[PDB]
Ligand binder design. Structure first.
Ligand SMILES: [Cu+2]
Ligand SMILES: [Cu+2]
Ligand SMILES: [Cu+2]
Ligand SMILES: [Cu+2]
Ligand SMILES: [Cu+2]
Ligand SMILES: [Cu+2]
Ligand SMILES: [Cu+2]
Ligand SMILES: [Cu+2]
Ligand SMILES: [Cu+2]
Ligand SMILES: [Cu+2]
Ligand SMILES: [Cu+2]
Ligand SMILES: [Cu+2]
Lengths: 280, 280, 280
């Protein structure tokens, strides 16, 4: 990018609060604020090098925790019962996540950076693998940017959790809206028991770290369909309606009974006047 | 390549006819000609930049459609009931598929080309996700070449559709024949309910866009076994018998009960005299 | 690497003996020595260009064979009943595996090398696809090094075989030990009926051939979770505790009922004094 906005260098030390709470309908969610928990939990986005101190508070009546993929954490912040890293009811604990930039090691080899599309979830509700917590909605996305990564206009999180999208009832979305030409980022995560295949009409991306081709030398497959299983995460960016125009573009699990049973949503791409060809 | 044949630049405007018909045994297939429908449907192969206008005719007594992966289409050619893009019985509709070359966008980023191994299928028979159409045989392969892509001697399509290969009865192939040294292209597609793993004896390929390593810098895994789920597509080329000689080489799903129940075929690689060591 | 040990050029002609035997508890395993069979079978590791002649002896009362992924073999060493390549009870057969370096073909294209993480298993016990042999433990890892590949301090093999890790009873590991800073290689293989997702706490790797990023230009996704199905194999290296320190780090299938039912182990990373923070 040379006109798109790109990520700066980290790393700052950042602090934030998270809460786990039971929702009125029986679900459980994370939130940055007591009373404003969501499923998925809020996006946490940092730059390679950042350190994040999370003051986590379990407001529920059962033990709960916070476990992250991909990022550096000491065993103190594992989020597991086994290393006494979870949180008693009403309790409070400070988790620490660090991230690093890539570079040469002394042995001459190349250390990978932390950058990528990751996620966090509970590891102790219902079972010692968080099966109950995850089923109830205790998951959320984490993005770590490499210096110079292209930044989007908007980021959406899509989570295939067992037979639901974002724990929603069958055939109730979510739907997302964009205007032709928007740079839209998708963070796609899978949880539970089943494998799925994520499919998007009218759009495609690269099957690599960023979902974007670096330039003509990148041999990564360009795809519009990807098989995923529990705790897989990936992400990409697309230009809404690029080459295809406005429309009510479906995304869905392409497993046939899954889409049939409601794992379907809409990517609503609008003309500037806000209209969508052949929609309602 | 510098002696293998390679793809030219597109794009021309191309026209063709497709038909959907019910087959005598209950299946449904696509064809370029009325009376000559097949499962899989015919290969459609174009060059990046080409535009294809498909005059599609539903000869069946139920609504049917044509939905493509990967290629650019306006929402008019979605192939879905939702955007009134399917076709009434006996009806005729012109779908339009476009393809583009990669290149710089104004923001300085890199737009991916359309090139790759794709497929088309019905989206409205039986359910609004084409579950019935796909089960009955309404699928086929699409290949889009990048300028300079290596062209094969022959292309074969292998479709894992639920528990069948190409809708065939258990243990009935298909089998494919080559002579030692042939450049054979495989287009491999999955449909239905189940995940599979595609495996080939005696041959391997690169897990990237083309299935071929560009040269020594490509870090892609070289494989002979790949997990696939519904609506996944990939493709590759191999040199028949390279380093291994002639033989009756099995390919199969490596899921153990699947191969046991008949998801097996033969890649028959022959010496010039047409004989195969230790075969029949 | 420029201080890590790296692989030399092959290829030598190497000979070895393998045996298949029934174990006292009903399982079946491979071994380099009669009486010392294991599940997984012993690691076989060679350099690109090597040739390996394996004098294989079936010590069991049923026919059995040796089938390899990835490596060059003539149809004589297919390991299948179909090409009369298996071994009668008490019988002995010499299998031959070859490997090649990458390079230009005459047509100007690039031939892939044999290098990668592969495996071997039976193809005739119980069924003609070795379903019984594989279930009983007749599998093992094969590594083929490219010249200049980084060599590890230790290699561990993790095999998801149906609902077991390395055919072990639920919740019995295996556990592996390292000291902070060790270069640990993992060879991960899946067998049987089911898909799994392999997950490691505190560590991540590159999703390419070697599991290592070549340098800053490699766009491969960096991951800590990977979906695998029957007969998939991959491998990687990590630095034990890099950025995270010592600890009892879990690895497990992330399919929720699988981890719940016991597909869990420990990567025990120790301080030099041998202690592990918050472990026992
Ligand atoms: Cu875990
Ligand atoms: Cu699904
Ligand atoms: Cu589609
Ligand atoms: Cu997890
Ligand atoms: Cu669709
Ligand atoms: Cu299968
Ligand atoms: Cu094989
Ligand atoms: Cu589709
Ligand atoms: Cu086989
Ligand atoms: Cu599993
Ligand atoms: Cu984890
Ligand atoms: Cu195999």
């Amino acid at each position: 990018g040379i006109t798109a906005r790109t990520a700066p260098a980290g790393g700052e030390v950042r602090h934030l609060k998270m809460y786990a709470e039971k929702l009125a309908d029986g679900q459980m969610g994370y939130g940055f604020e007591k009373g404003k928990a969501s499923v998925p939990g809020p996006l946490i986005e940092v730059n390679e090098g950042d350190t994040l101190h999370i003051e986590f508070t379990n407001t529920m009546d059962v033990r709960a925790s916070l476990h992250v993929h991909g990022l550096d954490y000491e065993i103190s912040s594992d989020g597991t019962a086994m290393n006494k890293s979870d949180v008693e009811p009403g309790g409070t604990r400070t988790y620490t996540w660090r991230t690093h930039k890539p570079g040469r090691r002394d042995d001459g080899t190349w250390r990978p950076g932390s950058a990528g599309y990751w996620h966090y979830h509970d590891h102790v509700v219902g079972t010692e693998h968080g099966t109950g917590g995850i089923r109830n909605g205790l998951y959320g996305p984490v993005i770590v940017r490499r210096k110079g990564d292209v930044l989007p206009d908007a980021t959406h999180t899509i989570v295939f959790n067992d037979m639901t999208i974002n724990n929603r009832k069958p055939h109730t979305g979510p739907d997302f809206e964009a205007t032709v030409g928007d740079r839209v980022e998708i963070v796609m995560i899978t949880h539970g028991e089943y494998y799925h295949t994520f499919h998007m009409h009218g759009h495609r991306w690269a099957d690599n770290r960023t979902g974007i081709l670096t330039g003509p030398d990148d041999p990564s497959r360009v795809i519009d369909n990807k098989i995923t299983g529990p705790a897989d995460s990936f992400g990409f960016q697309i230009i809404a309606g690029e080459g295809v125009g406005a429309g009510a573009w479906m995304y869905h699990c392409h497993v046939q009974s899954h889409s049939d049973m409601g794992m379907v949503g809409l990517f609503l791409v609008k003309k500037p006047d806000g209209t969508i060809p052949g929609y309602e």
